[PDB]
Amino acid sequence: KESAAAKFERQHMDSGNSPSSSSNYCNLMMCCRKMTQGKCKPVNTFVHESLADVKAVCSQKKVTCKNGQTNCYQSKSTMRITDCRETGSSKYPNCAYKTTQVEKHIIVACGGKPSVPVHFDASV
């Protein structure tokens, strides 16, 4: 059972000067989106585009994935994305990320039917 003391810490404690700071975006999203359980996912990109625009990439430019698979596609246009990358100081269970906002082309692997994005490969 989660002790009452530990529950209180989880539900009400967030010690710090700038808790609502945008440089915290990745720390909170990586946690919310469940990518900090068991280990700290080292790198992860968030796309701030319409889901309609991201799905459209699956019928755009064909390219080879980094792992040799052949079901990857590159966006014809650049997309507003946020790069979340683990800091040198990050150490599980205290995962820390650097938030970087950029506009780059994305590369995703598409699968299933209808064909939709199932993996983020890279940004170029």
Add this chain to the structure above:
Amino acid sequence: KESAAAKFERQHMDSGNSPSSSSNYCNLMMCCRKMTQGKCKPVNTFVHESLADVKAVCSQKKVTCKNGQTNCYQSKSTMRITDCRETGSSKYPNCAYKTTQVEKHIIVACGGKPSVPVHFDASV
């Protein structure tokens, strides 16, 4: 088994949410801290002071809890906290919170040996 398409949306999609937004704090924090599972937690306060300063409230001003219990204590000084409350448009599982930065005295219930904070009662 979560679908590949759904897994991609959870891990890489953040349409209509600006990374450079202070108002989003509550939404991400409530999600990250596991308070939006099963249903949306109506109200929840986050304290930004040090854990030591919060624990010390248990040795301060003795007051009655809202529920009639007698193990509540009020802080001698105002503390930096964030008040999170559901919006009108909040609907599970799309929980939405309004973020309000405030400086008020907190009231907590203390228990255990040593006596540590185990429930947040109110800010005044």
